[PDB]
Amino acid sequence: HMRKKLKAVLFDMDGVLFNSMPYHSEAWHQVMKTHGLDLSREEAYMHEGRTGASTINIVFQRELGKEATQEEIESIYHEKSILFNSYPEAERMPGAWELLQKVKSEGLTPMVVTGSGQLSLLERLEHNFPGMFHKELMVTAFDVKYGKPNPEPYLMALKKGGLKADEAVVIENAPLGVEAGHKAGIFTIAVNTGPLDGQVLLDAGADLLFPSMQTLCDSWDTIM
Ligand SMILES: [Mg+2]
């Protein structure tokens, strides 16, 4: 019955639309090294979904026992962007385009809800997923004060789309993201695209779990 109440599907970008997480984790790891801090690739994955600013500050708290200054945030963030974009551009997660076609064909509105401030990725959405997304139906780092795992971004999305929590579904791949969608009170589907135990996504409050975007796409008509 939830099924025909649906009006919008809310996608995270990294690890859901683009296969960028290998790169994000590498870039975080490396830029932290340069600044003289230990952030493993694995921990970088655990931070997926946060804004850059929130990530940097938390790493500073866990490692040095203090806040990062505003200048430290901008400086590390700029460098992280350089490192990220110095890799061959991230490609589409297999299945993402085909699922978006299924979503659109069912008359549903695609939205992006992301902690990303990476303009290279944000501006590539249209080129990769043509006709799917619009700026006014997106939430990015630029919109939020807190970001995931706070529900704030997902609540902003509902409002931007003029939706009620029961008129939406969230597609997330990372625990902080699942958590934010869940706390926004939205039915949340986890897709385990990363190197994580699918359990951690269930623990974060995911209503359904899939191993890949392809599997999710294949089972889209089964979902209720
Ligand atoms: Mg993600």
UniProtKB/TrEMBL annotation:
Q: What protein is this chain from?
A: Beta-phosphoglucomutase
Query: Which residues make up the binding site for Ca(2+) 1?
Result: 12, 14, 48, 173
Return the InterPro entries for the record: HAD-like_sf, HAD-like_SPP, HAD-SF_hydro_IA, HAD_2, HAD_sf, PGP-like_dom2
Q: Where does Mg(2+) 2 bind?
A: 179
Binding positions (Ca(2+) 2): 167
Q: Where does (R)-malate bind?
A: 12, 114-115, 148
Q: Which residues bind Mg(2+) 1?
A: 12, 14, 48, 172-173
